[PDB]
Copies of this chain bind each other. A is one copy, B any other.
Amino acid sequence: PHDPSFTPTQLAARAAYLLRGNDLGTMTTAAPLLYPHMWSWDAAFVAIGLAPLSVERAVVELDTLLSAQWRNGMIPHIVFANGVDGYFPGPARWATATLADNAPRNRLTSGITQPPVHAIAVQRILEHARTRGRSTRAVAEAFLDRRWGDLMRWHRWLAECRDRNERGRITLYHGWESGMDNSPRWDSAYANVVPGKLPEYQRADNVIITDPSQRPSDGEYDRYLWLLEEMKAVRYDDERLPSVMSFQVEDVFFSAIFSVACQVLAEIGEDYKRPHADVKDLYLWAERFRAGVVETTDQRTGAARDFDVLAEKWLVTETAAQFAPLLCGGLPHDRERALLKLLEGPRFCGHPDLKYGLIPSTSPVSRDFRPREYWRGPVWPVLTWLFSWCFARRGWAERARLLRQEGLRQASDGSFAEYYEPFTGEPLGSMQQSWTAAAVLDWLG
């Protein structure tokens, strides 16, 4: 009636209820119907949301993801649930099971990767487990014994195979690998993608989300799906992608995440007496990718740019990815103040028409802005959580607190929406999105 919002305990309960309801047994779908499988960075956030509920189950979630890790160390961005249809492109379209020599034998996966937030989830599990007593600590420590080597191979694959020239930035061969499918970041790179004979297909996502304004266009999907054909043609061989892919970009937000994840994992390695050589490698990558992020930055505002490897051009756009350097640190004092000022001012969090004091995925004042259209504008709870947690790690306690507070206010409708209209607060995308519930559980758990 007069106020449709939930109290903190009611909201925490519905968040946990949601998360258990998306559990298939050993994996959690990223949403009920739109994403009926395990997505890689979603699964790290699900593990974070599970840690206040069951350390054992949170560990299971990462165990399931890491059991799908490729032989060369890549964590694919989708681990498909057996027998489940309703997401396209599904296992048959990817054909990694028949074409990818490195794909796991016991799991169906996609053929591309996604950002390495996984060490952050590991840290949250360890922190929860240390508050829960000896037996729970044992569970978390046993997971480190089992999986430390796999997490290293994951970070090592990114540093060695997606940063071949040691530039300190991660090359993507698909926009899906950024986690921001249709970001304006990738428009000029996608304009150079020219599909050949693209095998017929039928989208599934817009059968579930029928409002065309909330999802990418058919033309975008044509390009998404053609890049799959380019990878398939070389059997997903790492060595051949630089020669054949029509899409090759350095992703500065992915890179900043990687810098933070390496430092987090390095600290975990020290605390739990992992091999010194590993910790040394992790610190080395943390510093290399921090520097690689800073090298992209605008000299006036500190804003980070992506880089189009094929066009050899800095990609200048007005999305939340510009704030990559706030995540990993490294800007000189004066430029970081400039970047925080851009973040808080009227092009982003301080825009006068915003319902909440939150970061829109694209600036409302950019010509690229579309208030409903996926990564072209809407406010994403997963980004609110990531910025808030990284800001607290920088020591910006009040800044982190304000993002968390506004994020809880936006989530208090209980829709657990994928993303929200920046001006009206209308829930968009899939309802009951697992990583939105997990953001809420962490903020309250």
A9 CA / B443 CA spacing, docked (Å): 10
Stoichiometry (number of copies): 4
- DSSP majority for the A interface? helix
- Measured as residues with beta carbon below 8 angstroms from the partner, the interface class of chain A is 35 or more
Given contacts A4-B133, A9-B444, A395 and B394 within 8 Å (CB-CB): yes
Distance in Å from the Cβ of A13 to the closest Cβ of chain B? 4
Contact present for B406 and A2 (CB under 8 Å): yes
The 8 closest A-B pairs by CB, nearest first: A20-B20, A13-B16, A395-B395, A9-B12, A16-B17, A12-B13, A392-B397, A9-B444
Tell which of B3, B15, B409 touches A409, judged by Cβ atoms closer than 8 Å. B3
Residue-wise interface mask of A (1-42) relative to B, using a CB-CB cutoff of 8 A (1 in contact, 0 not): 111100011101111110111000000000000000000000
* A43 on the B face (CB < 8 A): no
* A104 on the B face (CB < 8 A): no
* A206 on the B face (CB < 8 A): no
A337 CA / B12 CA spacing, docked (Å): 35
Residues of B close to A16: CB separation below 8 A: 12-14, 16-17, 20
* A160 on the B face (CB < 8 A): no
Residues of B close to A400: CB separation below 8 A: 397
Residues of B close to A392: CB separation below 8 A: 392, 395, 397
Given contacts A4-B132, A133-B1, A13 and B445 within 8 Å (CB-CB): yes
Given contacts A395-B393, A445-B9, A2 and B53 within 8 Å (CB-CB): no
Contact present for B131 and A1 (CB under 8 Å): yes
A406 CA / B3 CA spacing, docked (Å): 9
Contact present for A52 and B406 (CB under 8 Å): no
Contact present for A17 and B14 (CB under 8 Å): no
Residues of B close to A402: CB separation below 8 A: 131
24 A–B contacts from the bound complex (CB under 8 Å): A1-B133, A2-B406, A3-B409, A4-B132, A4-B133, A8-B9, A9-B9, A9-B12, A12-B12, A12-B16, A13-B13, A13-B52, A13-B445, A16-B16, A16-B20, A17-B17, A17-B53, A20-B20, A20-B21, A270-B337, A389-B397, A392-B397, A393-B397, A394-B395
